[PDB]
Protein backbone atom coordinates (compact mmCIF):
# COMPACT_ATOMS: atom_id res chain seq x y z
CA UNK A 1 0.00 0.00 0.00
CA UNK A 2 2.97 2.27 -0.73
CA UNK A 3 4.07 4.11 -3.87
CA UNK A 4 7.43 5.40 -4.98
CA UNK A 5 7.78 7.99 -7.75
CA UNK A 6 10.33 10.59 -8.87
CA UNK A 7 9.44 13.99 -10.33
CA UNK A 8 11.61 16.33 -12.41
CA UNK A 9 10.54 19.88 -13.23
CA UNK A 10 12.62 21.29 -16.08
CA UNK A 11 12.32 25.01 -16.86
CA UNK A 12 14.59 25.30 -19.90
CA UNK A 13 11.96 23.38 -21.86
CA UNK A 14 9.19 23.80 -19.29
CA UNK A 15 8.74 20.04 -19.33
CA UNK A 16 7.02 18.29 -16.44
CA UNK A 17 8.56 14.83 -16.13
CA UNK A 18 7.18 12.24 -13.71
CA UNK A 19 8.90 8.92 -12.99
CA UNK A 20 6.77 6.30 -11.26
CA UNK A 21 9.24 3.88 -9.69
CA UNK A 22 7.31 1.05 -8.04
CA UNK A 23 4.38 -0.08 -5.90
CA UNK A 24 4.75 -2.08 -2.67
CA UNK A 25 2.29 -4.62 -1.25
CA UNK A 26 -0.86 -4.97 -3.37
CA UNK A 27 -4.00 -6.15 -1.56
CA UNK A 28 -6.03 -9.01 -3.15
CA UNK A 29 -7.50 -8.13 -6.56
CA UNK A 30 -8.93 -10.92 -8.68
CA UNK A 31 -11.21 -13.57 -7.22
CA UNK A 32 -8.40 -15.80 -8.43
CA UNK A 33 -5.87 -13.90 -6.30
CA UNK A 34 -3.94 -12.52 -9.27
CA UNK A 35 -3.48 -8.91 -10.29
CA UNK A 36 -2.54 -6.66 -13.21
CA UNK A 37 -1.93 -3.08 -12.02
CA UNK A 38 -1.30 0.02 -14.10
CA UNK A 39 -0.66 3.68 -13.30
CA UNK A 40 -2.45 6.76 -14.66
CA UNK A 41 -1.22 10.34 -14.28
CA UNK A 42 -3.81 13.12 -14.12
CA UNK A 43 -3.30 16.86 -13.61
CA UNK A 44 -6.07 18.79 -11.87
CA UNK A 45 -7.57 21.27 -12.11
CA UNK A 46 -7.21 21.20 -15.90
CA UNK A 47 -8.84 20.44 -19.25
CA UNK A 48 -9.56 16.72 -19.58
CA UNK A 49 -8.46 17.37 -23.17
CA UNK A 50 -5.23 15.43 -22.73
CA UNK A 51 -4.01 16.30 -19.24
CA UNK A 52 -4.01 12.55 -18.63
CA UNK A 53 -1.27 10.04 -19.50
CA UNK A 54 -1.48 6.28 -18.98
CA UNK A 55 1.40 4.14 -17.75
CA UNK A 56 2.35 0.60 -18.76
CA UNK A 57 0.33 -2.34 -17.38
CA UNK A 58 2.08 -5.25 -15.68
CA UNK A 59 0.36 -8.63 -15.27
CA UNK A 60 0.34 -11.43 -12.69
CA UNK A 61 2.01 -9.61 -9.80
CA UNK A 62 1.63 -8.25 -6.26
CA UNK A 63 4.63 -5.93 -6.05
CA UNK A 64 5.54 -4.73 -9.60
CA UNK A 65 8.05 -2.04 -10.56
CA UNK A 66 7.04 0.41 -13.29
CA UNK A 67 10.14 2.59 -13.53
CA UNK A 68 8.37 4.52 -16.26
CA UNK A 69 8.93 8.16 -17.22
CA UNK A 70 5.77 10.06 -18.13
CA UNK A 71 6.36 13.48 -19.71
CA UNK A 72 3.96 16.43 -19.92
CA UNK A 73 4.96 18.92 -22.62
CA UNK A 74 3.13 22.26 -22.76
CA UNK A 75 3.30 23.10 -19.06
CA UNK A 76 4.28 26.58 -17.86
CA UNK A 77 5.60 27.90 -14.54
CA UNK A 78 2.15 29.44 -14.13
CA UNK A 79 0.64 25.97 -14.35
CA UNK A 80 3.32 24.48 -12.12
CA UNK A 81 2.18 26.84 -9.36
CA UNK A 82 -1.51 26.36 -10.21
CA UNK A 83 -1.97 22.63 -10.94
CA UNK A 84 -1.69 19.47 -8.86
CA UNK A 85 0.07 16.28 -9.94
CA UNK A 86 -2.01 13.21 -9.08
CA UNK A 87 -0.80 9.61 -9.48
CA UNK A 88 -3.72 7.20 -9.87
CA UNK A 89 -3.04 3.48 -9.48
CA UNK A 90 -5.79 1.17 -10.76
CA UNK A 91 -6.17 -2.59 -11.29
CA UNK A 92 -7.35 -4.22 -14.53
CA UNK A 93 -8.81 -7.73 -14.81
CA UNK A 94 -10.89 -9.51 -17.46
CA UNK A 95 -13.61 -8.07 -19.68
CA UNK A 96 -15.72 -7.66 -16.53
CA UNK A 97 -15.13 -5.11 -13.76
CA UNK A 98 -12.21 -3.27 -12.22
CA UNK A 99 -10.98 -2.11 -8.81
CA UNK A 100 -9.09 1.04 -7.82
CA UNK A 101 -5.92 0.45 -5.80
CA UNK A 102 -4.76 3.84 -4.53
CA UNK A 103 -3.84 7.38 -5.58
CA UNK A 104 -1.53 10.24 -4.59
CA UNK A 105 -1.87 14.04 -4.69
CA UNK A 106 0.80 16.75 -4.80
CA UNK A 107 0.74 20.48 -5.53
CA UNK A 108 3.07 21.16 -8.45
CA UNK A 109 3.86 24.40 -6.62
CA UNK A 110 6.19 22.20 -4.56
CA UNK A 111 8.29 21.51 -7.66
CA UNK A 112 11.37 23.67 -8.18
CA UNK A 113 12.71 24.53 -11.64
CA UNK A 114 15.49 22.10 -12.63
CA UNK A 115 14.95 20.03 -9.47
CA UNK A 116 14.43 16.28 -9.00
CA UNK A 117 12.65 15.02 -5.87
CA UNK A 118 11.97 11.40 -4.90
CA UNK A 119 8.65 10.46 -3.28
CA UNK A 120 7.60 7.49 -1.16
CA UNK A 121 4.24 7.56 0.63
CA UNK A 122 1.22 5.46 1.58
CA UNK A 123 -1.94 5.58 -0.54
CA UNK A 124 -5.26 6.58 1.02
CA UNK A 125 -8.85 5.45 0.47
CA UNK A 126 -10.94 6.80 -2.40
CA UNK A 127 -14.71 7.08 -2.84
CA1 LIG B 1 -9.56 -7.17 -9.51
CA1 LIG C 1 -6.05 -7.90 -11.95
Curated annotation (Swiss-Prot):
Ca(2+) 2 binds at residues 30, 36, 91-93. It is found in: Cytoplasmic vesicle, Secretory vesicle, Synaptic vesicle membrane; Cell projection, Dendritic spine; Postsynaptic cell membrane; Membrane. Residues 1-121 form the C2 domain. Ca(2+) 1 binds at residues 29-30, 91, 93, 99. Ubiquitinated. Deubiquitinated by CAND1 to prevent its degradation. Disruption phenotype: No visible phenotype. Mice are viable and fertile and do not display any physiological impairment. Additionally, synaptic properties seem unaffected. Disulfide bonds: none annotated. Specifically expressed in brain. Interacts with RAB3B, RAB3C, RAB3D, RAB8A, RAB27A and RAB27B. Interacts with RAB3A; this interaction recruits RPH3A to synaptic vesicules. Interacts (via C2B domain) with SNAP25. Interacts with deubiquitinating enzyme CAND1; this interaction results in the deubiquitination of RPH3A. Interacts with GRIN2A and DLG4; this ternary complex regulates NMDA receptor composition at postsynaptic membranes. Interacts with SNCA. Binds calcium via the C2 domains. The calcium-bound C2 domains mediate interactions with phospholipid bilayers. Plays an essential role in docking and fusion steps of regulated exocytosis. At the presynaptic level, RPH3A is recruited by RAB3A to the synaptic vesicle membrane in a GTP-dependent manner where it modulates synaptic vesicle trafficking and calcium-triggered neurotransmitter release. In the post-synaptic compartment, forms a ternary complex with GRIN2A and DLG4 and regulates NMDA receptor stability. Also plays a role in the exocytosis of arginine vasopressin hormone. This is Rabphilin-3A. It comes from Mus musculus (Mouse). The gene is Rph3a. The chain holds residues 381 to 507 of 681 of the full protein.
Amino acid sequence: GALEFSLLYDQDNSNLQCTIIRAKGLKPMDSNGLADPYVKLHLLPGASKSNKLRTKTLRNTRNPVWNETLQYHGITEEDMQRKTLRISVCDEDKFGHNEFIGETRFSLKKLKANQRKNFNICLERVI
